[PDB]
């Protein structure tokens, strides 16, 4: 099972992709980068936003 | 954003 997320875990629940091609973790659990509903337009995680 | 269900 492939593992994702700041968490190192494997997919659960709803996952939220970076919008950053480079980005090293790609998904992430929507909890672990503190969401609860899907956000509009582009979103970057906190490795790729600073 | 792009968004899944697990
Ligand atoms: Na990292
Ligand atoms: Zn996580
Ligand atoms: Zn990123």
Not at chain 1, 7 to 36: K, R
Request: net charge positive; with cysteine.
């Amino acid at each position: 099972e492939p593992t994702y997320c700041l968490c190192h875990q494997v997919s659960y629940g709803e996952m939220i992709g970076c919008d950053n091609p480079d980005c090293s973790i790609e998904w992430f659990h929507f909890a672990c980068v503190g969401l609860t509903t899907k956000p509009r337009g582009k979103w970057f995680c906190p490795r790729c936003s600073q | 954003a792009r968004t899944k269900q697990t």
